Amino acid sequence: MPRFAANLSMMFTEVPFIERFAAARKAGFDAVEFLFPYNYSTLQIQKQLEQNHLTLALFNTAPGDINAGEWGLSALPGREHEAHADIDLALEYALALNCEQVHVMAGVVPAGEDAERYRAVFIDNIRYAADRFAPHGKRILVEALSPGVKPHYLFSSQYQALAIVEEVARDNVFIQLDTFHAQKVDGNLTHLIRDYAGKYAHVQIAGLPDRHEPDDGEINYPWLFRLFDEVGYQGWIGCEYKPRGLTEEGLGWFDAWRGS
Ligand SMILES: [Mg+2]
Ligand SMILES: [Mg+2]
């Protein structure tokens, strides 16, 4: 262990998206995750998942218009019906692709706008997602994003994500503990992993501080893995990093930790 999932939106980008499933399997991954599958039919993706015997661990609700500065519609006042549409489409994909969880994106708060109003809207949209997903035994994830990656995003600290989930008050809503953002904003990863065990349903990793391979940087990942084992984490660890160079050329860390 741990159980690693390759993030196809960041890894194996040398080839077209649809070809990354085979690339991940060739490297030895049993699961994959990515951001947005919407430009492809559920049939297209399902075929690649089955062909390569892969588990789809996670994906996101749509970002909206990225070039207009959007990164989620669920926290945007007046866009609630579009957010619900994004949530419903994600459910359609999650059902067809046998994916247990979806990260419902919040959104960027325009300068001058009241963040509280956006937060209230986000909480109601997460409750909507939670109630739509519960009957199918699926869950909803909330991911804090560091400012270096997404300026002015609704929330950047794991503690803000945790408080939001606590207020959402749903048994199938959890945070997405991306250690890259956590180390950039909060630190004390042991406290988050150990004392909030049960509150995060997914984990992601990347090397600090440049977000490349996880076998170097200020965080000693092998030690973190021991912690995850201790607390009995049973989910997947998404490898969401930008390879320093060619994806394959930087997979030494994987062979080591998976072969051990
Ligand atoms: Mg992430
Ligand atoms: Mg801090």
Curated annotation (Swiss-Prot):
Coiled-coil residues: none
GO molecular function, one term: hydroxypyruvate isomerase activity
Keywords from the named record: Carbohydrate metabolism, Isomerase, Magnesium, Metal-binding
Catalytic residues (positions): E143 (proton donor/acceptor), E240 (proton donor/acceptor)
Catalytic reaction annotation: 2-dehydro-L-erythronate = 3-dehydro-L-erythronate; 2-dehydro-D-erythronate = 3-dehydro-D-erythronate
EC numbers on record: 5.3.1.35
Domain of life: Bacteria
UniProt xrefs under Gene3D superfamilies: Divalent-metal-dependent TIM barrel enzymes
Function: Catalyzes the isomerization of 2-oxo-tetronate to 3-oxo-tetronate.
NCBIfam families: OxoTetrIsom (NF043033), PRK09989.1 (NF007441)
Family as reported in the entry's similarity comment: Belongs to the hyi family. OtnI subfamily.
Protein name: 2-oxo-tetronate isomerase
Protein source organism: Escherichia coli (strain K12)
Taxonomic path: Bacteria, Pseudomonadati, Pseudomonadota, Gammaproteobacteria, Enterobacterales
Name of the coding gene: otnI
